[PDB]
Design a protein around this ligand. Structure first.
Ligand code: FMN
Ligand code: FMN
Ligand code: FMN
Ligand code: FMN
Lengths: 329, 332, 327, 332
C-alpha cells in the first residue's frame, strides 16, 4: 500500500506518460534547487522535549483569519487533468473535506465555476497571472470574488517560464480549458488593491529586500517559494530562505512556504522557523494520479497524521507551541 | 566466518523474513537519524598516545555501583523470539556469562520469571512502559524488585510509536514465544515523583537528547540517563546520539552517570562514547543480529567481539584502563 | 533534440573515437579540478529580485572596447579538425554570425589565413605560444596584426604539458599536429614589438594578478586550463574572486572553466568578470553539427543568460552585481 | 600500459590471490583512515606561481645528511615475496638504481645479508620491532650496523596488530622466500634510552600523529619522525597522515627532520607534503604494486613515475628546487 508521500511519487510515475511525469517534475536547467529543497530540510536537526503531557495534540491553525484542520494546504499547480480526468474538481472536493486551503491555479483544466460547483463550501484562494489587459484582470478578480474565493495569490517568480530541459527534449504537446500554446511590477500592485477587497498574497519571495518591498506595498501575506526549482535554478532552498524573510517581516504579516515538504517534520520545521503554514505542490498531483479525489485526500491525511505524530513526539501540544527552540542552531 | 558486528548484520538478514528484518531495522520516516547515528561516530578523529606501557589493559568498570566486564551492555529490545526461538532466555544466559548488564524490554517474548530462571545470577535492569493504572504499575515494579532487577528504565521518547514505513507497507503481522504481541501515553515529569515515591529501585531515564531535559532529570533526582534517539525508530531527524551525548554530559557535570546507545558497532565507537563522558554504552540491534545468527552463542560472540575491539583500540590509543579514557583522545 | 550544452556533450562523445574524446576531456592526473570547475559553480546561491520591469533585457557588453552580442566567447582550443572536417573555419563563421569574440588557438588545424578568409568580419583574438627565436615570435605577431586580430592572448599556465593519463594510455596518435622558458621580463619585450593589447590567460592568484598589472597588460583570463594542466588548484570561478579583488577594476578580468549554463555566466559577471569564454562546449558543438553546432551552443547559452537575467531582475549586463550572490 | 601508480594498483590486484591482495590492502576495522589518507590530500588546493624561469628543476634533497634523487622513498613493508619471488632483493636493486632510501622491514622474506648482497651500494634504513629479549635486540642492531644500514626505524603504532577484517574472514594462511612468516609488545619511551646505549645509528620514530608525542620524541633526542598512521592498518579513525603532518611540523619547529607516508600516489601529493614541512615522503603499498606487476622493473617504474610527476608539478607551480617548495603554495 501507499503509506507516505514518497510512495505516491513512485506510484504516480507509472500511471503517467513520461511526457506528463517530466512536466510534473520539470526541474529547471541543472536541477540543483529541486533536490536542494529536500536536502535543506533533511539537514536541520530537531531538539525534542519529552515527558510533557501530550494526550491532546491540536493540529489546527488559521491563515488570514480562516481556520483550517492543519497548516497543510494546496499550492497552485496547473492542469490537474494530466493526472486525473476530474482534474481540479477532485482536488476541490478533497480539499473541502480535509478543511484546508486550496489555491487554484490560473491555468486549471476546468473553469472556476465548475470547480467551485464541485465543492461549494471549500476554503480557497485564487492564483492569477496578471496580464497587460487589465480589463481581463479586474474581471477575473471580480469573477473570483463572486465565486467565493477568499484571497488572491500573485506569483512573482514567473515573469517568463523556467527552462525545463525535459519538456523541451519531449517537445511539449501537453495532452491531458485548453492548454496555452509579463511586465507586472511593484507599482502595478497599487492598482490591483484598488479593484479588489481580497487580501493579496505574494508568492515567490526569497529575499529580505523583496520582503520589505512587500510590506511597503501593504500586501496581506507572503509565500516563500522558489517555484519548486522550476524557474530560476540555483537559488536558496525555500526552507532556508524562510529564515531571512521571517526575520525581516517581524510578524507584521503571515509568512508561508512551499517547496520540498514531504514528511511531517518538514511541516514542523517550517512552523518552528516562523511559517504560518506550508503548501504542497507536486504531492497533490501524485495523489490525483494515483487515486483521484481519494488520492489527494490520502496525501493530506497522511501528512497531517505525521505532523500530529512529530508534534506529539517533540513535545508540542499545539501549533502555537512549535517554536525555534525545537531547531538546532 | 563472522568476524565483526557488520558480519552479524549481513548474515542476520538472511535467516529472517523481510517482515522481521524490516521490523528490526525500522527506521522512522525518511530514516535520517538511523544512518546519522553511525556517520556521527565515523566523523570523530582519535588522537592516540604511543609508547606507554600497555601490557595490562583493564576493560572493567561499574554502573550504578555494579561491576561489569566492559562498558558494553544490552539495551532494551522487544520480542527476541523473532530472531531466535529461545528469545530473551538465550539473551539472558549470554549476558550473564559475559557479565554485563541486560536491560529487559517491557515487551519481551517470555515472562520475566522464565527469563530470570534461565540465568539466575545475571545483572539486569527492567525497562517498563508506564500505563494509566497506578496499580498495574506498582505491581509490575514490585514484581520486578521481587525478581532481582537492580534498576528501572523509563523510556521517555515513545509517547506514541514512530512511523516505520516498512512495517506499514508490510502491514505488520509480527509472527514470532508466549506473551503475545500487543496488536497496537500521557506520562509526564510529575508522574515520576509519584513513581519514585512508590519504588526504591534506581531510575534511569532513556531517550534524553537535550540539556534542558537533562536538567529536569536531575531536578527530579533520577539515578541515571541513557542518551538515545531510540535508534532512529521514533522522532527522526534529531541529533545523532553520540553528538547529543556532549551537551547532556556537559549539563550533568558528573552528578549522575550518563550512558548512550545508537550506532555502536565497533571498538572505537565504545572508546569515543567513554572519552566523551559516557559511563558505558548499550547495544540495540547487534544483540538481535547475534540471536538471529547463533542464538545464545551469537549474542555472546557479539559481546566478546566488541569487547575484544575495545581492548584493542584502548591498547593502541594508550589507555590502560577505562579511567584513562579521556576527551584528550578526541580531536576538537 | 539537443536543448542544452550537456546534451551536446553526451552526443559529441558518440561521433568521436575514444582517442579524440579523451583528448577533449583530458583531465590531468587525478582529475580533481576538472570536476571542481563545475561543482564550484553549482554551490553558489543566487538572490533574485522580483517585480522589476524586465520587458527589455539587454545581453550586450564590450571587451577591450569591442561590442559583442553577449559576455559569451570562445576560449582557445587546439585542432578543431578532430571534431569536424572544416575545423576552425566552421567555428570562425559561427562566431562571426553570433557576433562574439573567437580566440584562435596557436595549434589550429587550418592556417590563420584560411580561417580569416572563411569569416572576414569576425571579431577575433590570437593565442600565441611564445618560442625562443624572437624573429618567429615577432613575425607571428605582425602576421596576426596584418590579419585583423584585435588582441594577443598569452597562456601562462602551460610551460610544460599537463599529465593526461587517458592520452598516455591511448598512446596519443592524434589523427584528425606537433609530435617553455617564458617569464615576466619577456613580457616587456613582446610589448615593444606589438601594439595589440595583451591578455594573460591562466592567472589563478592575486600575486600573479599584481605582477600582471605591474607589467601593464590589458586583460586577464582567470583560468586553470580546464583542469588539463596543474591539477588540484582552485576552481576558476573561485579563483575569480581574489583576482578581481586585487585588480580593483584597473583592467578587464575574464574567466573560463566549467561554464555550461546561463546562471554560470550570470555568476561570473556578478563576481566581477567582464565576460566568460567557452572551451570544450565549442568542440562539442562542432562534433555534433559543425558550424551550426557551434552557433547553437552559443545561442543556447545566450538564451539562458537572457532568461536568468530576466528571472533574477537584471535588465542589462551592467545591472548584474554581487548583491545577486549569497555570501 | 601502466602510466601512473593507480594503474599499478589495478594491475597488481590481478597477479595476486585475494588472500595476498587483501593483506596488502588490510584496512583496519571500518577502514575509515585508509580512504581518508587519500581524500585528505585531494582536498588541499594549490596556488601556482607562473612565468618564472623553470628551465632547470632540481628534485634532489637530503635526509639525515644523505643525498637522494627525490624526496620519494620506500617505507617498511613486510614479506615482499608475496608480490614477487625475488622479494626484497628486487626492491633493493630498484631502490639503489633510483638512488633513494629503502627502509627494510623487520619481517622481510629474505635475510638482511641476502638483501644487502643484491644491492651493495644501496642507501637503506632498518625498521626493527623491538622484543622482550634485548640480546636479540642489540645483536640485530649490531648486525644492521655491520651490514651498512644508516638508520634505525622504530615503529611505535603497532604494540599489537590492527584488526584487519579481511585477513580474518580469509583466515590468514600467508603463503608466499625463506625467512618464514611468523604465525603471529611492551616497548615504551624509557626503553628508548636502553636502545640508544647499544647503538650510535640515528633513530627515526615512525607512527607519530600528535604534537604531544612529537614533543616526547624530541625530549628523548631521536633524529627524525615519520608522521604516519600505518596506512590505516592499525588504529582506525585517526587523522589522515597529511593532516597530522601540520601539528607535528609546528611542534618540532625544524629541530629534527619530519617525514610522512600514507596515501601518497601522485606528484602533487609529494609536493603538498614538502610544502607543509615534510623533508620527504615514503611509499608503502605502491612499492608492492610495482613488485607484483614487473618485479624490480615494476618498483623502479613506480619510483620514476612519481619522480617525473613531482618534477612536473614543481615546474607548473613555479618551484625550481625542493628548497623553493613553501607553504605559500597551500591554500589556507
Ligand atoms: C506541474 C506543476 C504545475 C505548477 N503550476 C503552478 C502555477 O500555475 N502557478 C504557480 O504559482 N505555481 C505553480 N507550480 C508551483 C507550485 O505552486 C509550488 O511553488 C511548487 O511546486 C512547490 O513545490 P513542491 O512541488 O516541492 O511542493 C507548479 C508546480 C508543478 C509541479
Ligand atoms: C527490534 C527493536 C526493538 C526495540 N524495542 C525497544 C523497547 O521495547 N523499548 C525501548 O526502550 N527501546 C527499544 N528499542 C530501541 C533500543 O532500546 C535502542 O534505543 C536502539 O535500538 C539502540 O540502537 P542500536 O540499535 O543502534 O544499537 C528497540 C530497537 C529495535 C531495533
Ligand atoms: C581539447 C582542448 C584543447 C585546448 N587547447 C588549448 C590551447 O591550445 N591553448 C590554450 O590557451 N588553451 C587550450 N585549452 C583550454 C581552454 O582554452 C580553456 O582554458 C578550458 O578548456 C576552458 O574550460 P572548459 O572546457 O570548461 O570550457 C584546450 C582545452 C581543450 C579541452
Ligand atoms: C603489506 C604491508 C606491509 C607492511 N609492513 C610494515 C612493517 O613491517 N613495518 C612498518 O613499520 N610498517 C609496515 N607497513 C606500513 C607502511 O610502513 C606504511 O606505514 C603505510 O603502508 C604507508 O601507506 P601507503 O601504503 O599509503 O603508502 C605495511 C603496509 C603494507 C600495505
Amino acid at each position: 500500500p501507499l503509506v507516505c508521500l514518497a510512495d505516491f511519487k513512485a506510484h504516480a510515475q507509472k500511471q503517467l506518460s513520461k511526457t506528463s511525469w517530466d512536466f510534473i517534475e520539470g526541474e529547471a536547467d541543472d536541477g540543483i534547487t529541486y533536490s536542494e529543497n529536500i536536502a535543506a530540510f533533511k539537514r536541520i536537526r530537531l531538539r525534542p522535549r519529552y515527558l510533557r503531557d501530550m494526550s491532546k495534540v491540536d493540529t489546527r491553525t488559521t491563515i488570514q483569519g480562516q481556520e483550517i484542520s492543519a497548516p497543510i494546504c494546496i499550492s497552485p499547480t496547473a492542469f490537474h487533468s494530466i493526472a486525473w480526468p476530474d482534474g481540479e474538481k477532485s482536488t476541490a472536493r478533497a480539499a473541502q473535506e480535509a478543511n484546508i486551503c486550496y489555491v487554484i491555479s490560473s491555468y486549471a483544466s476546468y473553469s472556476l465555476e465548475d470547480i467551485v460547483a464541485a465543492a461549494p463550501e471549500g476554503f480557497r484562494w485564487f492564483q492569477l497571472y496578471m496580464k497587460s489587459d487589465w480589463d481581463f484582470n479586474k474581471q477575473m478578480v471580480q469573477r473570483a470574488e463572486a465565486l467565493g474565493f477568499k484571497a488572491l495569490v500573485i506569483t512573482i517568480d514567473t515573469p517568463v517560464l523556467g527552462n525545463r530541459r525535459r519538456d523541451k527534449r519531449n517537445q511539449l504537446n501537453l495532452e491531458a480549458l485548453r492548454a496555452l500554446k509579463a511586465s507586472f511590477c511593484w507599482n502595478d500592485l497599487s492598482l490591483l488593491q484598488s479593484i479588489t477587497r481580497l487580501p493579496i498574497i505574494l508568492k515567490g519571495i526569497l529575499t529580505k529586500e523583496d520582503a520589505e518591498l512587500a510590506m511597503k506595498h501593504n500586501v496581506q501575506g507572503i509565500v516563500v517559494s522558489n517555484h519548486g526549482g522550476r524557474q530560476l535554478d540555483e537559488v536558496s532552498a525555500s526552507i532556508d530562505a524562510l529564515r531571512e524573510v521571517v526575520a525581516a517581516v517581524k510578524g507584521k504579516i503571515e509568512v508561508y512556504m512551499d517547496g520540498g515538504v514531504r514528511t511531517g517534520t518538514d511541516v514542523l520545521k517550517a512552523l518552528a522557523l516562523g511559517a504560518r503554514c506550508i503548501f504542497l505542490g507536486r504531492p497533490i498531483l501524485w495523489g490525483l494520479a494515483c487515486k483521484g479525489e481519494d488520492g489527494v485526500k490520502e496525501v493530506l491525511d497522511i501528512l497531517t497524521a505525521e505532523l500530529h505524530r512529530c508534534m506529539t513526539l517533540s513535545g508540542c501540544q499545539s501549533v502555537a507551541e512549535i517554536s525555534p527552540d525545537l531547531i538546532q542552531f
